């Protein structure tokens, strides 16, 4: 619960809001809008939330995969964000994989939603 990091298609939840920002030149952080909890790709693949501003495993880089889709990558360990058909949500290294790419897109009230493509899944943080 507290802290997890899941995928859904229930697009009322208010948990799958995200604030995206610059954190030095060419990398940005993942926040929940709603719990102020950052994205986090662990060494070990797992991903969960942290409100700790001095992690290094917050940092990721977005890269244009093209078609309008992006792939979001951890900096520290080069770890792709991946949301798996179950709903899971873990890192990988395998750029071939076809759970990494996302659509970014504006929800609407300033946020912004984080969807796989494969899957149809938005990003969540829970609190």
Do not use: A, C, M, W
Request: charged share 25%; aromatic share 4%.
């Amino acid at each position: 619960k507290g802290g997890t990091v899941d995928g859904t298609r229930d697009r009322s939840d208010t948990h799958i809001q995200f604030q995206i920002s610059p954190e030095g030149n060419g990398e940005v952080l993942l926040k929940s809008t709603e719990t102020g909890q950052y994205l986090r790709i662990n060494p070990d693949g797992t991903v969960d939330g942290t409100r700790d501003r001095s992690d290094t495993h917050i940092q990721f880089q977005i890269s244009p995969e093209g078609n309008g889709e992006v792939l979001l990558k951890s900096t520290e360990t080069g770890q792709y964000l991946r949301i798996n058909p179950d709903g899971t949500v873990d890192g990988t290294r395998d750029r071939s994989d076809t759970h990494i790419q996302f659509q970014i897109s504006p929800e609407g009230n300033g946020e912004v939603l984080l969807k796989s493509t494969e899957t149809g899944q938005y990003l969540r943080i829970n609190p």
